[PDB]
């Protein structure tokens, strides 16, 4: 199919594969472009050298192309483009990329030579306990200082600054925030995807700043009693191992004090009895720095930590930062790695430097050259299967490409059921919320958007029936696959297409909580009025409350401050309270909404009313 080209032929060219290509999928086109050194970006821009679109382009991206005047080609044009251009990209943009590649290779070689020198020094010391070969590639190449961490440079700088002026903030009693603003908080959290060096960064910053590190695995120790004893006693005591560790030398005054680096804080037990909420009480009073670390910060059990900590989000490092590190480890370990593969490896692993390290360690045992020939199989065997966020499930579920004839073969129906089963508590709600905000692209001939929407709504009603049968006293969970199809897959297939606006979260939860609160309030008022009123709960709201308004709020609107007594009388005729009055006035809808009216009665009448009732 695609003709072969000279190595790094497409170097220095920014190519965006917007259009659908008959022969190659988007991933295949990206791979065949990155094999030759091309740069692929998701946004068409001024610096975009070439846009590849055979057909089926997007109107927004098309408008961007028209405004920016970017040259465009088709798939056959791309095939012609691959072969023609010379090796290594000539053009100045190609020369810049050549210089960058050479510089990265030189840095890798220099650091590999440095590692060889360190190994020789260690061998000389040993001649004069665990052998370095026995160590894993993850630990033998662990960063020894902040200057070797990959990505999140701002995050490590912020942590270093916070821990550095923590002493000054303590002198200021934490009331003053400072220039950076991190000094107000007494504890700091590092949260992000696994394996991006949160623990490494914390250990190294605490080492450089001279404090004595105390590490506690919060998953191992999560009970309230053990947590209390251990770290409550540790929060305000000195370090004996630190006092005896050469306090006589005056360089490090922080050597006595503690930095408690708590790992796997996401593994704490939940609830008031659980220790996840108790540790916030700890951070609310600390004489030593606290560095909590968690993977899933946006987790309900972790709500109490929100306001008592400095939240620091560690993000997945971009491939460019990690290329240099992988090049040093590859030059040292005598396995050939070409840079063009590196990016996809990171995309295979989703920004987990640890798993890329282990991937290279495992694969290099047999295959000594990781190149463009075997990268596809490596990705297909080592790809991370991570449960998508509900927003991503909604995006893929309401996607036209998924339910097309060609897309169905790539993503089978079983895969759509798996997408539902990733999160079985929210996808039915997300689809219900965002099945009517999409421009459809799978409308059958003779069907409008409204017909597909109505069919989808009928299917959601049937899925709600299935869910109730699933989630009731019968507990027919064997219908869970069926609830997969009726609630999520079928309506989305009916209204599949492009996303018109944004993907909103399920509004059902908030309005359901509001309805529960209003039902509770209505129960209180109804049981207060029961001794006089011969009604049920619903009848009161339907009939009496509209009449009760005319006898409660309207006299305040019309006759004036002398209505209080009369109002009080009818109040005392049904055992109403001031809270009862405020609740009744909050039940009306549409034309009779009282929120603006209660603002327009003068404050004198309100104060007199409360005073008279009291």
């Amino acid at each position: 199919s695609f003709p072969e080209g000279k190595p790094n032929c497409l170097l220095g060219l920014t190519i965006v594969f917007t259009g659908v290509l008959p022969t190659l999928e988007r991933g295949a086109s990206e791979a065949l472009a990155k094999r030759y050194g091309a740069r692929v970006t998701k946004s068409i821009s001024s610096k975009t050298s070439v846009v590849v679109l055979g057909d089926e382009a997007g109107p927004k991206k098309l408008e961007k192309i028209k405004q920016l005047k970017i040259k465009a080609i088709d798939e056959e044009g791309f095939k012609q483009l691959i072969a023609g251009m010379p090796a290594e990209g000539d053009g100045e943009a190609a020369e810049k990329a050549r210089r960058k590649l050479e510089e990265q290779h030189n840095i890798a070689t220099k650091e590999a030579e440095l590692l060889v020198k360190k190994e020789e020094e260690r061998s000389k010391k040993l001649a004069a306990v665990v052998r370095e070969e026995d160590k894993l590639w993850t630990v033998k190449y662990a960063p020894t200082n902040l200057q070797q961490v990959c990505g999140n440079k701002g995050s490590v700088m912020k942590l270093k600054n916070w821990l550095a002026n923590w002493e000054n903030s303590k002198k200021n009693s934490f009331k003053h925030a400072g220039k950076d603003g991190s000094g107000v908080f007494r504890a700091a959290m590092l949260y992000g995807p696994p394996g991006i060096g949160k623990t490494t960064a914390a250990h190294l910053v605490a080492q450089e700043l001279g404090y004595d590190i105390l590490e506690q695995n919060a998953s191992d120790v999560r009970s309230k009693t053990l947590l209390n004893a251990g770290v409550k006693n540790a929060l305000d005591n000195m370090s004996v191992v630190g006092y005896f560790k050469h306090n006589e030398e005056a360089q490090n005054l922080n050597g006595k004090h503690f930095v408690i680096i708590m790992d796997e804080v996401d593994g704490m037990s939940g609830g008031d009895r659980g220790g996840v909420g108790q540790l916030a009480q700890f951070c609310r009073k600390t004489s030593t720095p606290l560095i909590l670390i968690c993977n899933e910060r946006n987790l309900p059990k972790m709500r109490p930590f929100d306001r008592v900590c400095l939240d620091i989000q560690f993000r997945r490092p971009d491939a460019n930062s990690i290329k240099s590190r992988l090049m040093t480890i590859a030059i040292r370990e005598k396995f050939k790695l070409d840079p063009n593969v590196i990016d996809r490896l990171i995309q295979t692993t989703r920004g987990d430097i640890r798993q890329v390290i282990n991937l290279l360690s495992t694969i290099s045992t047999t295959t000594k050259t990781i190149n463009h020939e075997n990268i596809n199989e490596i990705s297909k065997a080592w790809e991370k299967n991570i449960a998508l966020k509900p927003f991503d499930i909604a995006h893929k579920m309401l996607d036209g490409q998924i339910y097309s004839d060609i897309g169905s073969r790539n993503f089978t129906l079983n895969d759509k059921i798996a997408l539902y089963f990733d999160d079985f508590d929210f996808t039915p709600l997300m689809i219900q919320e965002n099945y009517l905000s999409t421009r459809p692209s799978v409308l059958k001939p003779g069907q409008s958007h409204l017909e597909a929407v109505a069919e989808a709504a009928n299917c959601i009603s049937l899925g709600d029936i299935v869910e109730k049968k699933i989630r009731s006293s019968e507990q027919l969970w064997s219908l869970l696959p069926l609830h997969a199809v009726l609630s999520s897959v079928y309506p989305a297939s009916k209204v599949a297409g492009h996303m018109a606006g944004r993907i909103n979260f399920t509004a059902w939860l908030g309005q359901n909580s509001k309805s529960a609160k209003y039902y509770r309030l209505l129960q209180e008022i109804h049981y207060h009025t029961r001794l006089g009123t011969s009604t049920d709960k619903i009848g009161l709201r339907l009939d009496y409350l509209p009449t009760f308004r005319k006898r409660l709020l309207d006299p305040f609107l019309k006759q004036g401050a002398d209505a209080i007594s009369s109002v009080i009388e009818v109040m005392d005729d049904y055992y109403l309270t001031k809270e009862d009055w405020d609740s009744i006035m909050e039940f009306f809808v549409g034309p009779d909404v009282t929120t603006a009216i209660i603002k327009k009665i003068p404050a004198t009448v309100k104060s007199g009313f409360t005073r008279k009732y009291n």
């Binding site: 026995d134 798993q355 360690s361 045992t365 991370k384 129906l413 027919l476 009726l486 079928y490």
Partner: protein
């Protein structure tokens, strides 16, 4: 009688890594780690009976030599694998001192690791890293999704695949030669077909056929092992005429004793796994079988409801 012979599944279990037939690349990599040493943390995932426990045990034995008694720790789903075992048993085993060959390390084999509690899995995260210099953890599980992502990050992910018919035929031929069993090519082919890549089921069915009837023939194998239920379900679903499908349901399924719940569930699975039928038609037939499944689970399980389900499916196919 008082004593029983070993099943050929356990008697002929591979004791060296070379005997394992399928998934050649992973097995060769495990042999290279076996020779060189320094085995990283690993998670072995796949389908039942493709040699996951056997692979890890061959690797552990070959690595640890005579030190398998002390350096290797079994933990199975049959044992208590809560957070307690991580705190008390796993941590103490990993802290233990033991002098080993220069490259090899102590090995923790956690079989059926998919059933480990979330608390135990989270607690294992730091025991994995702190004591990695001395101990290397190995997990074997059917589903890799059940193991938390932080644990998945620290280990090499090896995914095993279903065994091709050729490898099953080779292993069965070897067992045939060692045990001097009389066979026919049709019987062996039927055994592979019924096994569907599950080598454990292949060996078990072969041994059962030999014991019950004495000759591995197509007739004997099909007598002792039924033809797959999903195949007759698929044939019933994809029938051209309603009467033909009704005949299949009556004779092959209802009269042979298959329960209505089984037919409906297998119909749903065959429908969702079918490829020739277009996705829209598959979804609508899935809806009809879902209605029928609800009716069956509500206590109304009869031939009439299944027949109505097939009639609806044929109406859907007939436009």
């Amino acid at each position: 009688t008082l004593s029983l012979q070993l099943p050929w599944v356990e008697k002929y279990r591979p004791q060296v890594l070379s005997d394992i037939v399928g998934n050649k690349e992973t097995i060769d990599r495990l042999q290279q780690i076996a020779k060189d040493g320094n085995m990283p943390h690993m998670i072995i995932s796949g389908m039942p009976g493709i040699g996951k426990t056997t692979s890890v045990h061959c690797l552990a034995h070959e690595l640890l030599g005579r030190s398998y008694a002390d350096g290797v720790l079994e933990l199975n789903a049959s044992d208590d694998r809560g957070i307690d075992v991580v705190r008390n048993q796993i941590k103490h085993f990993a802290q233990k001192k033991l002098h080993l060959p220069p490259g090899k390390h102590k090995i923790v084999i956690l079989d059926e690791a998919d059933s480990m509690t979330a608390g135990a899995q989270q607690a294992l995260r730091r025991t994995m890293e702190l004591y990695s210099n001395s101990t290397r953890f190995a997990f074997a599980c059917n589903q890799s999704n059940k193991i938390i992502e932080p644990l998945q990050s620290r280990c090499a992910i090896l995914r095993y695949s279903k065994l091709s018919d050729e490898d099953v035929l080779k292993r069965l031929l070897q067992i045939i030669k060692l045990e001097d069993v009389k066979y026919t090519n049709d019987g062996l082919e039927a055994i592979i077909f019924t096994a569907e890549g599950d080598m454990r089921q292949a060996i078990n069915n072969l041994q059962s056929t030999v014991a019950g009837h004495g000759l591995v023939n197509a007739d004997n194998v099909f007598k002792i092992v039924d033809s797959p239920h999903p195949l007759i379900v698929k044939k019933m679903l994809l029938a051209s005429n309603l009467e033909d499908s009704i005949q299949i349901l009556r004779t092959d399924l209802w009269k042979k004793g298959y329960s209505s719940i089984d037919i409906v569930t297998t119909s749903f699975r065959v429908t969702k796994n079918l490829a020739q039928v277009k996705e829209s038609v598959r979804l609508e037939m899935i809806k009809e079988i879902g209605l029928t499944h609800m009716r069956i689970l509500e206590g109304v399980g009869t031939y009439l409801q299944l027949a109505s389900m097939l009639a609806k499916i044929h109406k859907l196919n007939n436009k």
